[PDB]
Amino acid sequence: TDFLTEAHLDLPMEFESIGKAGSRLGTALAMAVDHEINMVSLVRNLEEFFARESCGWCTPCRDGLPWSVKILRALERGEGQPGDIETLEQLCRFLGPGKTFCAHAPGAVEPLQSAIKYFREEFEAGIKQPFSNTHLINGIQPNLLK
């Protein structure tokens, strides 16, 4: 289920009330997160659970949850690179209902998108190195994209 803030504590625990708030009622067994919990680490733990509990049938869950896991591991270690949060947002967009074979991956991407929406400053703090996907090959001048 999507994370909610302190201001959402006043609405009733019904299906449509939580659904209009941007989350799901789910099992209605709520979990509180205090200020001492890093949201990047928490969402990393959640996505490690969800990626390792993929059944492996369909491509977006099976091959997109581990990418989000690796991005969150890099963000937790301070080795994030530009485009990582954009990749996470696109993963939340493309793992929604109907895109995957079952509802496991939409539930996987609900906390990630909610935490990026509400606690973006913790995710941007993990980006500390420039983007580098290629090493230099001696004798070949790279195509310097702008």
Partner: protein, 198 residues
């Protein structure tokens, strides 16, 4: 080793006759008069070799002739188009002995990149060739290198001294291929300059 035309034979070569035949070959190889014949882009690099920045006149091979009777070397530098092939054959037939042929460029060598309905696949389909130059085009110094190869071929050949005295057969030396001669130094190359610099 030698090739006979009138057959693979041995070297036929008195001590005055051998020296004077060597002087004949030296005069022939140091006085080569190419024929002026423009086919395609390879001719542009050939006349680039004729100019001042290369100066093929140093070898004595700048005398360009518009008449095949006064030309000893025919440089087929260009594509052998089907309409031009009888012209090339007639120009080659109009030349006088001794006559040598250098194919310049992939078109003259084999047809090159034009395996097409209107191109003869190489000038050796109908005209004998003594020196082939790969390239498209070969650079002017490659033409000069082929000229030196032709001089080495000329200096090792035996031709009839006169049409009334002696053997009238033409002997052409079966020289070692340049590929096998340069295989010793070419394979030993390890590192080349990187293409990023100048």
């Amino acid at each position: 080793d030698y090739t006979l035309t009138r057959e693979i034979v041995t070297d036929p070569l008195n001590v005055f006759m051998g020296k004077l035949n060597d002087m004949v070959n030296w005069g022939r190889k140091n006085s080569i008069w190419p024929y002026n014949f423009g086919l395609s882009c390879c001719y542009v690099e050939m006349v680039t070799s004729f100019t001042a920045v290369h100066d093929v006149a140093r070898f004595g091979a700048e005398v360009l002739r518009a008449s095949p009777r006064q030309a000893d070397l025919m440089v087929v530098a260009g594509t052998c188009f089907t309409k031009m092939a009888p012209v090339i054959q007639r120009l080659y037939d109009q030349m006088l002995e001794p006559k040598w042929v250098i194919s310049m460029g992939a078109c003259a060598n084999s047809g090159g990149m034009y395996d097409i309905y209107s191109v003869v696949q190489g000038v050796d389909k109908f005209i004998p060739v003594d020196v082939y130059i790969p390239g498209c085009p070969p650079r002017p110094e490659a033409y000069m290198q082929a000229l030196m190869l032709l001089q080495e071929s000329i200096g090792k050949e035996r031709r009839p001294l006169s049409w009334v005295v002696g053997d009238q057969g033409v002997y052409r030396a079966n020289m070692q291929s340049e590929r096998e001669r340069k295989r010793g130094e070419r394979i030993a190359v390890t590192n080349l300059r990187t293409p990023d610099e100048i």
